[PDB]
Symmetry: none
Subunit: 145 residues, 2 copies
């Protein structure tokens, strides 16, 4: 349940905190006052994203590392009205990077990068994944809260 | 009752028993109709921190085993031809790198070589590994 917030600063405003707070529809202050300030567990953003979801009670299904060429095939197999996390490997990043996404009733995809306030809809999604130097990806589909 | 694989599998991995697990936790029902969902929700409750794997066919299981690091405890949720829901067993990759599987509800222990025979006998179709990172007994 949301607390009063100013988006806070330093490094609670990381992808994985920011992506998790958007999907739970809460804020990063509610996220640090419960659970705490999570360091990078085991060096993998995936591991720290997963264990942040375990801490806050998100029940998810995981889809393993694949090349970004076959991402629309994963998009097509997702159920309609579904929210999910998206961990990407990046050419100029030594760790992963997390964005959020949703599938609407009509089967469209919308992607949201909360840390950079970036919102992408179908028909701009291909250009975005290319512009962002995304290579591999891993989808975390929420089942329940 | 509470003699269910997911409770029994979680209590075997935690090095405890289900009755002292259930005064913790309570008796949580089948969340979302999913044995996977119920295992995840039971593990978050008790503090088992896991890495979730993609559902995969049982044929590709020896490769998943092959990539697991030594000294690993894990759960394994199976799809079963004659079961409407999943079934949970426990697993280990010890220091020497052998795989051992334990079905707690039916007290069965399976080691390498018998694993292909075992998974075929049990009518398992796909599977999903939950690798333990952290316990709090
Ligand atoms: Cl709202
Ligand atoms: Cl990883």
């Amino acid at each position: 349940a949301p607390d009063t917030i100013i988006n806070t600063s330093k490094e609670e405003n990381n992808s994985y905190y920011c992506a998790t707070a958007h999907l739970l529809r809460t804020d990063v202050c509610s996220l640090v006052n419960r659970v705490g300030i999570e360091p990078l567990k085991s060096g993998s953003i995936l591991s720290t994203l997963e264990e942040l979801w375990q801490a806050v009670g998100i029940i998810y299904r995981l889809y393993e590392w694949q090349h970004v060429s076959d991402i629309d095939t994963n998009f097509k197999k997702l159920p309609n009205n579904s929210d999910f996390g998206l961990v990407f490997s990046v050419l100029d990043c030594d760790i992963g990077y997390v964005i959020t996404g949703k599938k609407d009733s009509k089967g469209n995809i919308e992607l949201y990068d909360p840390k950079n306030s970036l919102l992408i809809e179908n028909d701009d999604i291909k250009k975005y994944l290319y512009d962002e130097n995304f290579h591999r990806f891993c989808i975390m589909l929420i089942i329940s809260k």
